[PDB]
Amino acid sequence: TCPFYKKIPGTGFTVDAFQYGVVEGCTAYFLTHFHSDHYAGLSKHFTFPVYCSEITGNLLKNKLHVQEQYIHPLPLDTECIVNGVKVVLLDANHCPGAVMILFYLPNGTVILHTGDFRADPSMERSLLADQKVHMLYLDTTYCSPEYTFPSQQEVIRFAINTAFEAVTLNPHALVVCGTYSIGKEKVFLAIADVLGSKVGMSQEKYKTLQCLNIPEINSLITTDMCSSLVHLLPMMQINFKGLQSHLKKCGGKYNQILAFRPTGWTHSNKFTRIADVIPQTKGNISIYGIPYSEHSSYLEMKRFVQWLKPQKIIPTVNVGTWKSRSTMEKYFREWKLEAGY
């Protein structure tokens, strides 16, 4: 049964609740981004409205095969009426197409629902600057002080340098990159850019990438693997037994794979910096883990909530146990008391 934190009060609207059947009273289903936890349920056979970003729309039409009439895409940064309610979509700084939703109620209440997000100072000079928010449905994926990680631009440095080192040392070396959903495209695009290659991928991942309104995308990617020296692969495949396997298939065109597993947080964030990273090594295959997050760090989240001074906070992540819920409220209280809202 749709949990209360996927419902918006004073509307027939719901957020990321497509896996329960019909939700009694829901006239419109919002979807924040194309990630299988959030869309679990959608298909060609849906005949209620869906509101979402243009980019998320393309993924619905072309990947899940939803029927164009039911996909209502909306522009960002635009005051837009929906079933007699003002809403706005804002860039969430998560994966391509990912949005937060501003709801403006008849009764005067204002609600912000973050979806998945990586909070950033640039959001404090958006439309949110203009007015008060009474409720915050917040992405609490990394709501604990242990959770730190470097900036995306830091990590993209490390990558560009590493790969470019190796390839310049050994020009018969392949760069690989793992992936299982959209997100983190800047990893492989930046590597390929510094190397003078296009990125090569399976047919389905090419299909996925062609939906995302990346400019000049045609010059950057291909389905011709032979012609490319930055390859993509399923993250399940990024290991020695499966990389060895793949290295065979290239057919004596490369003598060393240099991979990258863009991960989120792992416990190795606690004791080691980004400039001091190492990979696992079994023969001529070298696998990096690299903490490229598309979720807020504890500090980033903290700053954002303390600027927003919401009157109330409703967690959307790690809400499944009483210990996690309790831990999270303590942090909310601390933030509130530090800041004087």
Side-chain angles (χ1 to χ4, degrees), residues 65-119:
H65 300 298
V66 176
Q67 295 159 66
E68 192 152 305
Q69 69 196 136
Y70 305 110
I71 306 160
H72 304 257
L74 302 163
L76 312 173
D77 301 340
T78 305
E79 299 192 277
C80 285
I81 312 310
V82 168
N83 298 4
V85 182
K86 175 148 78 158
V87 308
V88 180
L89 315 189
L90 305 184
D91 209 283
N93 187 40
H94 185 44
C95 68
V99 298
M100 318 181 285
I101 313 158
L102 263 179
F103 302 88
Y104 296 67
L105 279 42
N107 78 340
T109 296
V110 189
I111 299 171
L112 180 61
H113 190 304
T114 62
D116 281 357
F117 89 129
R118 171 159 190 174

Side-chain angles (χ1 to χ4, degrees), residues 4-23 25-203 205-215 217-240 242-247 249-269 271-280:
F4 80 94
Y5 73 95
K6 295 193 174 284
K7 302 164 166 199
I8 306 311
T11 58
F13 303 163
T14 63
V15 175
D16 292 354
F18 292 97
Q19 57 160 313
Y20 307 97
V22 181
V23 182
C26 185
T27 45
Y29 293 73
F30 286 78
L31 173 68
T32 59
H33 64 289
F34 197 75
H35 270 169
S36 65
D37 284 352
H38 299 264
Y39 67 63
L42 277 170
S43 67
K44 69 184 81 184
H45 313 299
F46 209 76
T47 59
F48 301 111
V50 179
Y51 295 81
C52 53
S53 61
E54 172 166 17
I55 289 172
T56 295
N58 304 339
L59 294 168
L60 296 180
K61 176 183 171 179
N62 295 287
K63 301 295 292 187
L64 303 179
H65 300 298
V66 176
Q67 295 159 66
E68 192 152 305
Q69 69 196 136
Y70 305 110
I71 306 160
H72 304 257
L74 302 163
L76 312 173
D77 301 340
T78 305
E79 299 192 277
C80 285
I81 312 310
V82 168
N83 298 4
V85 182
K86 175 148 78 158
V87 308
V88 180
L89 315 189
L90 305 184
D91 209 283
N93 187 40
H94 185 44
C95 68
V99 298
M100 318 181 285
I101 313 158
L102 263 179
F103 302 88
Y104 296 67
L105 279 42
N107 78 340
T109 296
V110 189
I111 299 171
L112 180 61
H113 190 304
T114 62
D116 281 357
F117 89 129
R118 171 159 190 174
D120 185 79
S122 57
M123 311 180 159
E124 302 155 20
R125 289 166 296 289
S126 82
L127 291 205
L128 290 169
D130 303 3
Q131 90 302 278
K132 160 184 205 76
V133 172
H134 304 69
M135 309 183 80
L136 191 59
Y137 291 63
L138 175 68
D139 163 32
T140 42
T141 303
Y142 294 125
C143 186
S144 192
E146 62 271 38
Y147 301 109
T148 82
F149 32 68
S151 84
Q152 284 167 169
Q153 191 288 311
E154 288 190 78
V155 177
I156 288 294
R157 187 76 288 179
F158 180 74
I160 286 169
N161 294 12
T162 298
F164 182 92
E165 179 158 295
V167 163
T168 310
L169 292 168
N170 172 214
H172 305 274
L174 176 56
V175 174
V176 182
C177 284
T179 193
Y180 44 31
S181 68
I182 72 185
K184 308 196 205 168
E185 284 84 11
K186 186 58 160 184
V187 174
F188 59 78
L189 290 173
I191 298 186
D193 196 73
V194 89
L195 294 187
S197 197
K198 298 190 186 187
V199 184
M201 48 197 79
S202 75
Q203 274 203 249
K205 188 68 195 192
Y206 190 87
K207 189 188 177 169
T208 300
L209 294 185
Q210 284 289 172
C211 300
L212 323 178
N213 291 342
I214 292 162
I217 186 56
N218 288 338
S219 74
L220 310 186
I221 61 165
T222 181
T223 57
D224 181 3
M225 303 293 276
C226 300
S227 61
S228 165
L229 76 126
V230 182
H231 296 186
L232 308 198
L233 275 189
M235 195 77 68
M236 276 196 69
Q237 197 164 336
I238 310 286
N239 52 83
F240 301 116
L243 285 159
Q244 285 159 207
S245 195
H246 177 84
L247 188 56
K249 277 161 255 172
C250 282
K253 200 169 184 305
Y254 305 113
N255 56 357
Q256 180 198 348
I257 286 164
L258 182 130
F260 291 96
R261 302 203 325 118
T263 51
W265 175 93
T266 55
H267 191 59
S268 47
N269 270 255
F271 304 104
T272 313
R273 287 160 140 71
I274 199 67
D276 316 346
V277 169
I278 72 160
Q280 280 189 228

